[PDB]
Design an enzyme around this catalytic site. Sequence first.
Site, PDB file in Angstrom:
ATOM      1  N   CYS A  66     -23.664  -9.638   9.291  1.00 33.60           N
ATOM      2  CA  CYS A  66     -23.352  -9.288   7.862  1.00 33.60           C
ATOM      3  C   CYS A  66     -24.633  -9.175   6.986  1.00 33.60           C
ATOM      4  CB  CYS A  66     -22.412 -10.335   7.265  1.00 33.60           C
ATOM      5  SG  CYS A  66     -21.820  -9.893   5.559  1.00 33.60           S
ATOM      6  N   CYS A 122     -25.547 -11.536   3.933  1.00 40.69           N
ATOM      7  CA  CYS A 122     -25.871 -12.842   4.495  1.00 40.69           C
ATOM      8  C   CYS A 122     -27.360 -12.889   4.846  1.00 40.69           C
ATOM      9  CB  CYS A 122     -25.057 -13.100   5.767  1.00 40.69           C
ATOM     10  SG  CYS A 122     -23.291 -13.580   5.428  1.00 40.69           S
TER      11      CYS A 122
END
Lengths: 105, 105
Positions: free
Chosen positions: B32, B35
């Site tokens: 992700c 992130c």
Amino acid sequence: MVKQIESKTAFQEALDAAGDKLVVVDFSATWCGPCKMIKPFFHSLSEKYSNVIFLEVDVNDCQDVASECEVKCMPTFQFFKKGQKVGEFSGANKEKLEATINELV
Amino acid sequence: MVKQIESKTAFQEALDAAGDKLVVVDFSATWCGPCKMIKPFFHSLSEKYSNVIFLEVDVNDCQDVASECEVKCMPTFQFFKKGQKVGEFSGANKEKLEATINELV
């Protein structure tokens, strides 16, 4: 019925073979409660609407597809027509899922 | 510095040993984009605020912890004081992260 996608090549080919049909993709994770909660309903939709293609993609299995489609919540439903994304939302909302399909089909 | 959690036992023990300090937990996934984008800033916060404990939990590594804390978006920051959750939000917003820490410390 729902088609299980297990590679980027398979993802692109399905979008291709789709032709003029609406494609609905369910991005999920095995450990996420809502995802498991909405799975049976998602499968029922594929039996009700035979003129729409339903695909499932486990984000852990295809990290490359998840990353490129910019997924960040589970589950995320993305809608495509002729290779293009024409809709998107996240969360396990049954009414909204079916209502969106009726708008884009 | 940031503590890497790799089991439910370790998660519960950290919350215990925390005493009266604020605990900030970053729930993330390696694939992700946000992130990865906010990771360096999260580590900088742990060096700036030495009176706060920072923990990182990969949702794929600890599926049991992710499921029980009811995580559904990445990244998700959960705040705890004396074993209790006192705050929560998702998304890589740097200002909001630090602003929340100043409110709960």
